[PDB]
Design a protein around this ligand. Structure first.
Ligand SMILES: [Mg+2]
Ligand SMILES: [Zn+2]
Ligand SMILES: [Zn+2]
Ligand SMILES: [Zn+2]
Ligand SMILES: [Zn+2]
Lengths: 107, 112, 110, 43, 83, 168, 96, 171, 157, 93, 98, 316
C-alpha cells in the first residue's frame, strides 16, 4: 500500500501491476482524510472465502454473472481491497425486515 | 330452438368436425340436434364473468372481472364503489368490455 | 450509499405529494437501478442497452437499430422474457403459467 | 412484482424552493448528470 | 432434474396462481366429460363441479414447479395444503 | 510472344466474330495505344469501339492502365494503356473449357399446368387406377446429344493441346 | 376494440397468462406456419392435401415443425427477412 | 432392410379417456397409429415389439384443449429401403415406362430406360408382359431388383431400381 | 445409399431406452418373418387374457391372425407377411438358429449380413456385386464356402 | 393453370354455390344448410403527349371527362401505321 | 353481381328512393352499377352473370329514419349525381348527455 | 379453421438472429423477378416473373397460389430474389462496416495491431462481444499503418487510410493527400480476406454473421402478403409503396446492367450505381439524415420498411 500526497507520474502507475500475485494499492492522502464506512448510509461489508462463496452459489443455484455486481472503482471496493470474482456480503438495516443480508461480486 | 333473436339463444354451432353452422338459415332446414362435444355459441347470460376496463388503465385495479347482469337500454350499469379504482365518473365516459371465450380463462377471471 | 441515498431521493417526492407508497415497490425499483454496479438510468440508454433478449429490447425504444445490431452479432434470444413470449403468442412463464400442469397415474388409480 | 411496482410508482406521479414533483422524478429516473438545484445538508 | 421428495424445498401451500390454473384446467376437462370423482349435489356448471372436487382433493393432477436453475419439483395437488 | 498470339487467335476463332479478332491483331501490330489510337487506326467509330471495349471488359482478355499526361496544356491528356495480361486470359480459358466439359458430361412436364417433374416425382406421380404419370394439382397428363457434344469437344481438344504446348 | 400495451400490463400485473394468450391469439388473430428444423426460416413449402413438405435449399422433406404465431409476428419476420435479417426459430434449446 | 429400433412417439388423450384403465388406451392408440404406418425418417413401421414393458413416462397436460400429452418409448420392427440395395419382388402393375415391383410394403418402379436392350415391352399379352430374349416378365413372375434410388417423404416412401446389371432380372 | 453409410438413426451405434449402448439390429428375412409371426402369438394371448374378465397354408393362417391381432386396417403388413412368407429362405427358427450363427463370424456390417441371408447368392462375385462392400474385406472363397453352406442349409420349399 | 377457387358446400352439393356473404361477421355462408363457407373475410412519347394534351384541354376549360375520353382515344391511335405522320399537332386536335 | 343483401324494394326505377319512404339500416338508398369485362375477372359466377358489378351506397348499418329530400344535379363537369337527406327524431335517452 | 396438418406441433423456444447468406437467399427464393411490370400485358392475371407472379403468394381469395396451392388464408407467402448487377451496402450496417474497415487492414485484410500488444491482450479477455468490438476499435482506428515486423506477424506495410462517411459513400484519405471514394467491391473483397479468428474476434459469428453478408450481393423480395395491393372504390387498383420501390430497384438495376454491358462512360456507371444504392437505401430506410427522401408521385414520402416498424402503431 502506497499513499501519495498530490499525484503520481503515469509511468509509476503503469509499473504497479508488475509483481503477480503481489499487488499495490495506491491511495491519495487527501482522499483518506475521512473513513467512509463510518458514514451512516454505508452498511457493513464482509469479504468472503471461496468455500463460503461456492456454498452461496450452490445454495441459490447461481452463476457468478447472476449475482448483483459491484465495480472495482467503488470506494468501498478499494477500501477492502477487493479483487475480481470475490464476493462481498452486505448487511443493511431495513425498515421492513430490520436485518437484510445481500451479496455482491466485484466485476 | 330459441334462435338468435330472442335473448337466451345461440348464434352459431360448431360440430365436433370443427365446422361452424350459422343458426340464421338453419331454421330453413328446420332441425338441429346436439351431440356431446359440439360447441354451441350462446349469448352472454347472467353471471358470465367478463373483464371490464377503463383506459388509460394504469392500475392493475383498472381491469377487473365482473359478473354480468343483462339489463335493458344502452349504458353499462355498475355500482359506484367501483368508480374510484377505474378513476371513473359518469359523464360521457366509456368502458371496454372483454368476454373470455374459453372455460379455462373464464375460470381464471373469477379466481384472480 | 448511492442506493440508500437514491431510495431517500425517490421517497421524498412521494411524501412531498402527500401520497404513500409501500416500501417494497420503491425498494425494488432502486435495486434494479443498481445491481449493474453503477447507477443505471431508465432510458433508451440505461437499461435498454443491457444484454437482455433482442425482442424485449427492440420493443421499448429503438427497434431498427436494436434489430440490426442483433442480427449483426448473431445474438441468441432464449425467449424467457415476457414481451418476447408475447410477440410469439405463446403462454408466458409468469403467473398462471410460471409452472406446468401434469397428470399423474398414481393418485389417478386411487 | 416488477410491473406492480412500476405502476405503483408511476400512478402517484399522475396525481402530481427545492425542485420537486414530477420534474424532479424525471431527473431521478433519467439519472441526470447535472440537475437544477444541487444541494447539501451538513450536520 | 426432478429433485427428490425428501429435498423438496418449496412452499407446501398452493399459490393462488396455481389454484386458479388447476381450477381452469380441471373444469375444462370436466366440460369435455373426463370422469368426475365426486358425487354431485345436482351441480351443472363445470367450474363449480371443479371447485367441488378441489375441496375434497379428488383432483388427480400434479404440479411441476420450475426453479430458476431449470430444475423442478413435482407436488401432487392432493398433497398441497390449500388456503 | 508467338505462342500467346496464336492462343489469342484461337480464342478469337472460338469466342467472337472476325472484327474483334482483327482489332486484337491490330493491337498486336502496334506496341501501345492510348484510347484514340484504334480510332485513327480503324474505320470504326468511337461509340462502336465502345461496345467492343465493353465486350472486352466483360472478359479477362486484356488489361487497362489509366494514365494522364500531366503537362498543363488545357486539360492535360487522358491516355489509356491497353496491355494484354496473359495469366488472366489463361485462367479464364481453362475455367471455361473445364466448365464446358462439365456441362457436356451433365423428365416430365404437364401441358396445361406447365409444371416440371423428375424421377423422384415419378414415384410420387404414379397412379394405380390408370397407367400414367399424373400432375399434382391439375392431374394432367405428363410429357417430355452426348456424341455431338463429343465432336464439338474434338474442337475443344485442339485448343487444350495448344494450351498444353503453351504451358510446356 | 383496442387491447393495448398498458391494458396488457394490467393483465401481467394480475399474473393471468392464459387470458393474455387467448386475447392475443384467438380473440384477435392466430396463424399456423411450418418451419424447417435446420434453417429456422418459414421457407417450408407445405403442399397438403398430399401431406407433402419441402424446405428447398436445406433439402429437408423430413423434419419440419408446426407452430402457431400471431399473423403480425409472421409479418414482422418476413419484414426482417426482406430487410436481410434472419429471425431463425427453434423449438429446442441448443444453449441448454 | 428389415431392422428393429427403439422409437419415441407423442400421443394425445382427449380428456374423456382419463379413467384409471387409461394406460391400456395408450397402448391401444400406440398400436393403432404406429403399426402399419410409414414415417419418412425410420421407414415403414411394421410391428411393435415388447408390448408389455412399454414405458409411459409422465403425462403432461398442455394448454387449451386440456388434452393429455405423453411420450412413449417403445421397441419395434420397421423396414427401411436403401439406395444401392438388391431386393426381390413380385410385379403388380405394368406400365410402358416399366413394371412396378412389389417389395414388402413398398412398391418399387423400374424405368424401361433402366432395363436391358433385349428386354422389350409387350402389350399384346394379357396382362401386358416384358418378353426378353430369354426371360418373360409378368405379374406373378419373380424378379431380383437392385434399388437405384429412394424418395423419402414424411408419412410415405417411393423408389426406383434397375435389373439392367449382372446377377439381376427374373428370379 | 450403400457405402455402408446409413441414416443417423440407422447408424451402426444404437442405444436402448435404459440408456445402454447397442449395435444396430439388422435382419435377413427368415426370422424376420418369424419374429413378426412370433410376437402376434403372445399378442393374441394378451387379447384373450383380458377377454376373460406347404407355405401356402401359412399365408391364410397368418391372414386370420392378421384379422385378429391386427385391426385389419393394415394392408402393408398383409403385403409384408406374404412377401416374407413367399421369399423366406428358412422356414424354421431351428434352421435359422444356425444361420444367425454362421452368417455372423468375421463381424461383417449389419447391412451386409442382412442381404446375405435374405438373398440367394452362389459365386463370390454374385454376392460382392449385389453387395459392393464385400469386395476387399473378405476373400472370395471364404465367402463362397459360406454361400455353399447357405444353399445347403436352405429349408426345402 | 387452374388456380381459380370456387366455394361449394360439401354437405349440400346439390347445386353449384348459392350462398350469401355476411360482411359484418366477415364470413360467407351457404343459404341452405346454413354452413359457414369462409371466415375472416378481409376488407416517353405517351407521357409527353398527355402532358401537352393536358395543357391544351386545360386552356380550353373542358371538363375532365372530355379530357380523359380524348386521352383514351389518343392511346388507341398511338404509334399505328395508318396514321403515318401528322407531326403530333394534328393528332392532338 | 357482388350485390348487397339489403333489400332493394324501395328503389324507384331510376335508382333512387323517393322521399317520404321510411328506411332502416342496411337498406340501399342509391342503386349504382358498373360494367365489367368478362375476361377481366371471371371470379365466382361472374362468367354466368355476364354484365354489371353492383355499387350502391347503403344507409348506415345502425341508422334508420325517413328520407326527407332527394335532389339530382349535374356537377361542374357534367356528371349526373344525387344527394339524399334522411331525417330522424332522436329522443333523449338514458345514455344521452347534457 | 385452417386445414389439418400431420406435422408435429411444437412451440418456439430458442430464437436466433443472423444475416442472409446470399447463397441461402437463392436457395430459398422461388423466382428471379426480372420484369419491373406488375400485372400481365393482357392486364389480367400476373406478369409471371414480374414483381408479383403466382409463384409468390396470392390474395383475392379466388387465386390458389401455384407453389403452395391452398388459399390466401393458408399461404404464408413466398420469397423472391433479385440478382444485383453490382454490390451495394445494407444501409443499417453502413456505420458498423465503416468501423470494421477502420479496425482491419485495407489490403492484406488482417487485424491491425496484433495479439502481441498488451492493450489488445487485455481487451480480448472481455467476454462481451459489443464491448470487445468497441474497445478494439478504439485502438485500431488510431494506428494508420499495417506493419510487417513487430518486436515480441502479418506483412503488407501499406498505410491504412482514414475512412469518412460522406453521403452514403466511404472516402479514403491517405497522407502518404490521396483522396479516393471507396467502391463496394474492393471493400467486400477485403471482408472476404478477413480471417475467421479476425471477425470472430470482432462481434461476428462465423456461421450466422459475416461482413460479406452485411454487404448486399443479392436481395430478397417479400411476397405480396407483406406488401398487399388495396382497391379504391373496389373498381380502381391501388399499389403498395414497397411494390413501387421494388419497381425502382429493378429498373435502376436493369439500367446499370445495360450501361455496364456496353457503352460505359464510367461517369455514367458511377452515377447509375449511386442511383441503385440510393433506391435500395430508401427502400430499407427512407428517413436517413441528410439524404433526399423518396417521394411517391402524390408528393407523400414513401413509407419504408423501417417506417413500418419504427414508431407507435408500427408492427411492434
Ligand atoms: Mg368522465
Ligand atoms: Zn429449411
Ligand atoms: Zn350448404
Ligand atoms: Zn403459397
Ligand atoms: Zn496490412
Amino acid at each position: 500500500i502506497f499513499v501519495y500526497q498530490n499525484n503520481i507520474t503515469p509511468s509509476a502507475m503503469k509499473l504497479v501491476p508488475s509483481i503477480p500475485p503481489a499487488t499495490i494499492e495506491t491511495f491519495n492522502e487527501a482522499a483518506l482524510v475521512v473513513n467512509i464506512t463510518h458514514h451512516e448510509l454505508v452498511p457493513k461489508h464482509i469479504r468472503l472465502s471461496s468455500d463460503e462463496k461456492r456454498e452461496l452459489l450452490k445454495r441459490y443455484r447461481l452463476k457468478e454473472s447472476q449475482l448483483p455486481r459491484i465495480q472495482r472503482a467503488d470506494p468501498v471496493a478499494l477500501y477492502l481491497g477487493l479483487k475480481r470474482g470475490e464476493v462481498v456480503k452486505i448487511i443493511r438495516k431495513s425498515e421492513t425486515s430490520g436485518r437484510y443480508a445481500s451479496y455482491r461480486i466485484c466485476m | 330452438r330459441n334462435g338468435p333473436n330472442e335473448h337466451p339463444g345461440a348464434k352459431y354451432v360448431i360440430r365436433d368436425s370443427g365446422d361452424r353452422i350459422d343458426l340464421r338459415y338453419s331454421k330453413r332446414a328446420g332441425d338441429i340436434q346436439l351431440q356431446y362435444g359440439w360447441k354451441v355459441e350462446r349469448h352472454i347470460m347472467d353471471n358470465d364473468p367478463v373483464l371490464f376496463n377503463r383506459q388509460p388503465s394504469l392500475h392493475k385495479m383498472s381491469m377487473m372481472a365482473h359478473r354480468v347482469k343483462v339489463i335493458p337500454y344502452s349504458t353499462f350499469r355498475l355500482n359506484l364503489s367501483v368508480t374510484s379504482p377505474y378513476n371513473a365518473d359518469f359523464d360521457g365516459d366509456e368502458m371496454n368490455l372483454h368476454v373470455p371465450q374459453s372455460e379455462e380463462t373464464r375460470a381464471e377471471l373469477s379466481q384472480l | 450509499a448511492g442506493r440508500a441515498a437514491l431510495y431517500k431521493e425517490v421517497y421524498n417526492v412521494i411524501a412531498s405529494d402527500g401520497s404513500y407508497v409501500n416500501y417494497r415497490h420503491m425498494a425494488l425499483l432502486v435495486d434494479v437501478m443498481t445491481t449493474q454496479g453503477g447507477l443505471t438510468s431508465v432510458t433508451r440508454h440505461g437499461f435498454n442497452r443491457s444484454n437482455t433478449g433482442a425482442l424485449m429490447r427492440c420493443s421499448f425504444e429503438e427497434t431498427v437499430e436494436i434489430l440490426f445490431e442483433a442480427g449483426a452479432s448473431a445474438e441468441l434470444d432464449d425467449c424467457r422474457g415476457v414481451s418476447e413470449n408475447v410477440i410469439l403468442g405463446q403462454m408466458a412463464p409468469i403467473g398462471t403459467g410460471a409452472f406446468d400442469v401434469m397428470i399423474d397415474e398414481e393418485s389417478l388409480v386411487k | 412484482v416488477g410491473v406492480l411496482a412500476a405502476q405503483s410508482i408511476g400512478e402517484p406521479a399522475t396525481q402530481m424552493k427545492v425542485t420537486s414533483g414530477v420534474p424532479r422524478l424525471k431527473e431521478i429516473l433519467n439519472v441526470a448528470k447535472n440537475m437544477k438545484t444541487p444541494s447539501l445538508t451538513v450536520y | 432434474k426432478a429433485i427428490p421428495k425428501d429435498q423438496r424445498a418449496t412452499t407446501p401451500y398452493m399459490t393462488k396462481y396455481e389454484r386458479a390454473r388447476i381450477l381452469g384446467t380441471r373444469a375444462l376437462q370436466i366440460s369435455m366429460n373426463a370422469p368426475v370423482f365426486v358425487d354431485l349435489e345436482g351441480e351443472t356448471d363445470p367450474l363449480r363441479i371443479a371447485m367441488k372436487e378441489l375441496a375434497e382433493k379428488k383432483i388427480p393432477l400434479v404440479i411441476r414447479r420450475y426453479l430458476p436453475d431449470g430444475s423442478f419439483e413435482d407436488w401432487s395437488v392432493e398433497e398441497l395444503i390449500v388456503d | 510472344d508467338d505462342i500467346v498470339k496464336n492462343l489469342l487467335k484461337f480464342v478469337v476463332r472460338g469466342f467472337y466474330g472476325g472484327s474483334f479478332v482483327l482489332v486484337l491483331d491490330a493491337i498486336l501490330f502496334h506496341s501501345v495505344l492510348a484510347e484514340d489510337d484504334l480510332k485513327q487506326l480503324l474505320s470504326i467509330n468511337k461509340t462502336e469501339l465502345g461496345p467492343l471495349i465493353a465486350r472486352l471488359r466483360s472478359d479477362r482478355l486484356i488489361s487497362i492502365h489509366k494514365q494522364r499526361e500531366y503537362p498543363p496544356n488545357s486539360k492535360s491528356v487522358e491516355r489509356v494503356y491497353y496491355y494484354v495480361k496473359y495469366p488472366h486470359a489463361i485462367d479464364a480459358i481453362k475455367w471455361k473449357v473445364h466448365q464446358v466439359v462439365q456441362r457436356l458430361k451433365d423428365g416430365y412436364m404437364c401441358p396445361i399446368c406447365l409444371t416440371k417433374y423428375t424421377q423422384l416425382e415419378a414415384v410420387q406421380l404414379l397412379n394405380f387406377d390408370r397407367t400414367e404419370f399424373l400432375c399434382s394439382l391439375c392431374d394432367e397428363p405428363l410429357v417430355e446429344k452426348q456424341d455431338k457434344l463429343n465432336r464439338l469437344m474434338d474442337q475443344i481438344q485442339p485448343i487444350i493441346d495448344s494450351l498444353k504446348k503453351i504451358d510446356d | 376494440l383496442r387491447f393495448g400495451e398498458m391494458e396488457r400490463d394490467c393483465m401481467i400485473a394480475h399474473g393471468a397468462a392464459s387470458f393474455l394468450k387467448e386475447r392475443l391469439m384467438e380473440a384477435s388473430d392466430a396463424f399456423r406456419v411450418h418451419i424447417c428444423g435446420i434453417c429456422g426460416l418459414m421457407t417450408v413449402i407445405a403442399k397438403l392435401n398430399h401431406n407433402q413438405f419441402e424446405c428447398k435449399g436445406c433439402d429437408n422433406k423430413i423434419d419440419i415443425y408446426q407452430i402457431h404465431i400471431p399473423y403480425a409476428a409472421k409479418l414482422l419476420f418476413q419484414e426482417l427477412m426482406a430487410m436481410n435479417i434472419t429471425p431463425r426459430l427453434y423449438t429446442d434449446r441448443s444453449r441448454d | 432392410m428389415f431392422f428393429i429400433k427403439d422409437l419415441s412417439l407423442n400421443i394425445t388423450l382427449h380428456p374423456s379417456f382419463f379413467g384409471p384403465r387409461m394406460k391400456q388406451y395408450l397402448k391401444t392408440k400406440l398400436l393403432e397409429e404406429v403399426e402399419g404406418s410409414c414415417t419418412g425418417k425410420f421407414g415403414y413401421i411394421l410391428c411393435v415389439l415388447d408390448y408389455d414393458n412399454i414405458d409411459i413416462q409422465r403425462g403432461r397436460i398442455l394448454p387449451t384443449d386440456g388434452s393429455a400429452e405423453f411420450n412413449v418409448k417403445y421397441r419395434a420392427v420397421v423396414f427401411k429401403p436403401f439406395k444401392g440395395e438388391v431386393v426381390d419382388g413380385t410385379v403388380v402393375s405394368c406400365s410402358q415406362h416399366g413394371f412396378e415391383v412389389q417389395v414388402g410394403p413398398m412398391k418399387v418402379f423400374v424405368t424401361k430406360h433402366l432395363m436391358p436392350q433385349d428386354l422389350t415391352f409387350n402389350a399384346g399379352s394379357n396382362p401386358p408382359s416384358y418378353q426378353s430374349s430369354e426371360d418373360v416378365i409378368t405379374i406373378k413372375s419373380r424378379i431380383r431388383v437392385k434399388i437405384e434410388g429412394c424418395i423419402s417423404q414424411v408419412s410415405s416412401i417411393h423408389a426406383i431400381g434397375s435389373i439392367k446389371e449382372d446377377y439381376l432380372g427374373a428370379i | 445409399a450403400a457405402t455402408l453409410q446409413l441414416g443417423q438413426e440407422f447408424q451402426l451405434k444404437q442405444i436402448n431406452h435404459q440408456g445402454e449402448e447397442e449395435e444396430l439390429i439388422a435382419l435377413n428375412l427368415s426370422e424376420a418373418r418369424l419374429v413378426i409371426k412370433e410376437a402376434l402369438v403372445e399378442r393374441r394371448r394378451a387379447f384373450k387374457r383380458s377377454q376373460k374378465k406347404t407355405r401356402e397354408k401359412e399365408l391364410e393362417s397368418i391372414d386370420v391372425l392378421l384379422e385378429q391381432t391386427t385391426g385389419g386396417n393394415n394392408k402393408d403388413l398383409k403385403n409384408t407377411m406374404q412377401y416374407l412368407t413367399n421369399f423366406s429362405r428358412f422356414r424354421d427358427q431351428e434352421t435359422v438358429g444356425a444361420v444367425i450363427q454362421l452368417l455372423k463370424s468375421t463381424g461383417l456390417h449389419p447391412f451386409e449380413v442382412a442381404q446375405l441371408g435374405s438373398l440367394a447368392c452362389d459365386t463370390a462375385d454374385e454376392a460382392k456385386t449385389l453387395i459392393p462392400s464385400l469386395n476387399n474385406k473378405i476373400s472370395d472363397d471364404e465367402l463362397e464356402r459360406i454361400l455353399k453352406e447357405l444353399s445347403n442349409l436352405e429349408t426345402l420349399y | 393453370p387452374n388456380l381459380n377457387i370456387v366455394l361449394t358446400c360439401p354437405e349440400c352439393k346439390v347445386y353449384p354455390p348459392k350462398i350469401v356473404e355476411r360482411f359484418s361477421e366477415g364470413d360467407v355462408v351457404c343459404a341452405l344448410c346454413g354452413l359457414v363457407l369462409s371466415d375472416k373475410l378481409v376488407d416517353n412519347e405517351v407521357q409527353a403527349a398527355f402532358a401537352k394534351i393536358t395543357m391544351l384541354c386545360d386552356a380550353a376549360e373542358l371538363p375532365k371527362i372530355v379530357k380523359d375520353c380524348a386521352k383514351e382515344a389518343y392511346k388507341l391511335c398511338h404509334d399505328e401505321k395508318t396514321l403515318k405522320g401528322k407531326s403530333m399537332e394534328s393528332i392532338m386536335a | 353481381l357482388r350485390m348487397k343483401h339489403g333489400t332493394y324494394d324501395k328503389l324507384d326505377d331510376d335508382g333512387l328512393i323517393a322521399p317520404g319512404v321510411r328506411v332502416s339500416g342496411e337498406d340501399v338508398i342509391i342503386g349504382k352499377t358498373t360494367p365489367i369485362s368478362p375476361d377481366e375477372e371471371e371470379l365466382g359466377q361472374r362468367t354466368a352473370y355476364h354484365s354489371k358489378r353492383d355499387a350502391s351506397t347503403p344507409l348506415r348499418s345502425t341508422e334508420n329514419g325517413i328520407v326527407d329530400q332527394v335532389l339530382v344535379t349535374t356537377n361542374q363537369d357534367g356528371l349526373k349525381f344525387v344527394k339524399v337527406r334522411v331525417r330522424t327524431t332522436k329522443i333523449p335517452q338514458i345514455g344521452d348527455k347534457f | 379453421g385452417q386445414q389439418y396438418s400431420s406435422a408435429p406441433l411444437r412451440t418456439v423456444k430458442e430464437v436466433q438472429f443472423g444475416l442472409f447468406s446470399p447463397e441461402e437467399v437463392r436457395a430459398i427464393s422461388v423466382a428471379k423477378i426480372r420484369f419491373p411490370e406488375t400485372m400481365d400485358e393482357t392486364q389480367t392475371r400476373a406478369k409471371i416473373g414480374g414483381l408479383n407472379d403466382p409463384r409468390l403468394g396470392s390474395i383475392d381469395r379466388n387465386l390458389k397460389c401455384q407453389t403452395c396451392q391452398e388459399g390466401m388464408n393458408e399461404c404464408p407467402g413466398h420469397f423472391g430474389h433479385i440478382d444485383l448487377a453490382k454490390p451495394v451496402f445494407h444501409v443499417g450496417f453502413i456505420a458498423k462496416i465503416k468501423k470494421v474497415c477502420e479496425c482491419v487492414c485495407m489490403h492484406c485484410g488482417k487485424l491491425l495491431l496484433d495479439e502481441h500488444n498488451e492493450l489488445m491482450r487485455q481487451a480480448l479477455a472481455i467476454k462481451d462481444s459489443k464491448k470487445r468490438f468497441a474497445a478494439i476499435w478504439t485502438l485500431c482506428k488510431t494506428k494508420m499503418v499495417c506493419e510487417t515486423d513487430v518486436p515480441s506477424r502479418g506483412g503488407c506495410g501499406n498505410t491504412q487510410p482514414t475512412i469518412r462517411k460522406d453521403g452514403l459513400k466511404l472516402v479514403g484519405s491517405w497522407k502518404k493527400p490521396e483522396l479516393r471514394v471507396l467502391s463496394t467491391e474492393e471493400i467486400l473483397n477485403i471482408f472476404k480476406h478477413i480471417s475467421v479468428k479476425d471477425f470472430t474476434s470482432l462481434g461476428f459469428n462465423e456461421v450466422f454473421s459475416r461482413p460479406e453478408w452485411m454487404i448486399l450481393t443479392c436481395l430478397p423480395v417479400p411476397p405480396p402478403p407483406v406488401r398487399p395491393s388495396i382497391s379504391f372504390n373496389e373498381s380502381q387498383r391501388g399499389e403498395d409503396d414497397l411494390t413501387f420501390k421494388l419497381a425502382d430497384i429493378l429498373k435502376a438495376n436493369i439500367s446499370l446492367e445495360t450501361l455496364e454491358h456496353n457503352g460505359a462512360p464510367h461517369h455514367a456507371i458511377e452515377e447509375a450505381e449511386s442511383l441503385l444504392q440510393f433506391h435500395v437505401a430508401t427502400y430499407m430506410d427512407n428517413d436517413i439524415a441528410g439524404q433526399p427522401q423518396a417521394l411517391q408521385k402524390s408528393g407523400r414520402p414513401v413509407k419504408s420498411i423501417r417506417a413500418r416498424l419504427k414508431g407507435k402503431e408500427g408492427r411492434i
